Amino acid sequence: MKNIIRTPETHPLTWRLRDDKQPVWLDEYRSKNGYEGARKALTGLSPDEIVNQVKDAGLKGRGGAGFSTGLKWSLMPKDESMNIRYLLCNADEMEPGTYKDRLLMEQLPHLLVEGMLISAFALKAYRGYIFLRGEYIEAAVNLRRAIAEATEAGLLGKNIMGTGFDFELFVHTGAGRYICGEETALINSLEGRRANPRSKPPFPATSGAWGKPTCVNNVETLCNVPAILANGVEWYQNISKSKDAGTKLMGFSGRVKNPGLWELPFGTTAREILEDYAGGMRDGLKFKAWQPGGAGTDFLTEAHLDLPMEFESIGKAGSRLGTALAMAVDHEINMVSLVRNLEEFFARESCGWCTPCRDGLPWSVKILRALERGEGQPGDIETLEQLCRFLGPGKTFCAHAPGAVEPLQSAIKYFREEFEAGIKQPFSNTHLINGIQPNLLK
């Protein structure tokens, strides 16, 4: 579908993009209704009024989990003695299959700057950090230039717009770990420590970065904020007739005709995304599987392609919506090799804190290597299944290992024939010792 008319009413995030894929700087951004929501927020709205406005707009988190943003902002302490607060932008985006934040920050940096400004004013957060991955050189350059332009234009720094709100925005480039995207591990990596996640409670809203109240939000959530405050609650609730309010960046990748990213309302079915926007599979390819929201989501089949891309609709199907960036797997891809690659990523991106991930993902990796080489033995599939069952939520310290075992569980559930075809050798981990008769178990 080339005929995409990106009006600001239906495409609040991508209507001011440019055809040559060039970044929109401060003059062009303010020409196309820039910092209107920030002006309204900082000249005619209380911070609690903004928090309640975002809560009434129903803005959920765009970083995969779908937690409500207004409820997260309302969990900040009501003490007036805690005024050293921090806002963090999770620009890490280390999940395989996820490329939305790169587009948003390379081409519209001032949208992120305005969203950080509005969210910091709502949270009464004196300081803001953009935790960005180190592989995004152009996004870092564009964000630093946008921050410099907003600072010289009076939109950042001391006494913004004459209200008296002081806000300083920094860009922190990471050093390449997938676990750094997890918000408590993100806080640990921001503090100059090893990025081990933290147990919750306490949540970062009460004790976050350097012990202060801290709110971590994804890039796309903070890009959703300025349109909410520039158009209103009823406009954000009246663009989609679904329980998930607002629009979402969705797109199919991998052996499709037009891989890319498009802004679509919630409740859009995955089949029409794949057929109209992605163009379907390429020539001589048969669609066999797909992942809805990145490497940490369960595989779904052709029958699940008709489901709307919502949190609850895909949650009921045995998966989760995730980042809503789907990946298509054709019939030429062996599922054992694909899950082997996924589990190698998840095993080597472990942080090493807790036993089941650290010592059970490598066992699953070695089993999958054996099944890919055809050297599988009986009990390997049962071992994979009990690794899936014992790496679920609550068994491990953070959510990295449940997201690791979701593709393994789904692929064993659907494409079990390949995993059973990997097994060719009899089971043996004990060799013969010359003078000792073995205990011949049955």
Place this chain on the structure above:
Amino acid sequence: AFELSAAEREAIEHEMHHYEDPRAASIEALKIVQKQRGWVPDGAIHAIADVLGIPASDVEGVATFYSQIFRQPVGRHVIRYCDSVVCHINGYQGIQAALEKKLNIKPGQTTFDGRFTLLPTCCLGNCDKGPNMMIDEDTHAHLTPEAIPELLERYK
């Protein structure tokens, strides 16, 4: 054996100004030393620790936790080819085989000339244009195995 230059120390202190705690500039200090010297040598750990006022074991734990902070010497150009699932579907194995045939090295090793270091990196966040490669600061997408012996020849 190691001594921080004046520009390195000034950049490290400037990064220390941006945080509540001077410990929070450890990753930036390691990246500054790596940018100036190609990698982080052994004396640099104690130098960074002495500047930041944190123990050298904390600096070493940070430097060995993060894969982009190099702790062994590397080549002049670090090839970082993507390894994740979407580039697996788009065929990164042909790219890896082409790189290993052209450079005659396994991943994680350096050529005898000291020109290239081959590394399998994580997902580069460019999955719709896969397979992806990242030489020192440049991302190259839409890779084909026949374009490698031309792509590698403009990094002298």
Place this chain on the structure above:
Amino acid sequence: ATIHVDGKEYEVNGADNLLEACLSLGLDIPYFCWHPALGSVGACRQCAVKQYQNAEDTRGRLVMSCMTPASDGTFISIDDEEAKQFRESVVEWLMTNHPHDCPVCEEGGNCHLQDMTVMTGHSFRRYRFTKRTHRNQDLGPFISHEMNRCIACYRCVRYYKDYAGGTDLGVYGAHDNVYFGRPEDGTLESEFSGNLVEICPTGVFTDKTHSERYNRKWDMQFAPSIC
């Protein structure tokens, strides 16, 4: 506070966590990363029990007893089959990379890892692949270092750094190649480094002075004395 463990009623301190409250009652829950003097961090995932919402609940949920408060009216099960299977699985995951070292290990007969391996009932190996190995460091004349035996329970760094205030011991690395030691070879600088031989549940940090003239714990003649 009142807790119900396996249908039996106990009166505990509500400011305690469930692991220390149940160990004070004489109940046996396996654990590695918890120490009474160091607090709870929930790393090793060994102390799992099954917590129920109320008395008339049967499904329950596996919780870490070291990270769970012993609040009033709590319902847990230690001998639940799911909890026992998970604890045995944690021991098995630790056993996958552990070296075949007990006869030539100074910790043998005095090893918390041996005790918890036997306590969970894990005695059958089905892992068939390779074991990760590590180089050792020279930690000085008092502490001998054997990094193969590590189960990554983080007790050494928590004691030495957070408790004792030492600066030259740390954790380095990542996913399953975590290394606990000094940044380089040299003598451990803390005046309280010798407590690592009892803090470490395995034989990584061992009494080198004892190791020169080693004998097992059952062969010792002990007495209570004053330093």
Place this chain on the structure above:
Amino acid sequence: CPTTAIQLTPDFEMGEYKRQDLVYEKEDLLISGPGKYPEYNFYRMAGMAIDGKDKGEAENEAKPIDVKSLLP
């Protein structure tokens, strides 16, 4: 015995004149061969390094990956 070092052998002629001579030291016990278990070597299985066997050279052992290595 976890190394198959100590073994009971088919031999019964052990009478003595003095009871003190029934205390056998190591030079009275150490034979010049493997006995009833001809091939088992405990040290080929143990992870502890000795002469002729470095770290990673035991059975079912991978080579030690240095913490400073470049591979993730």
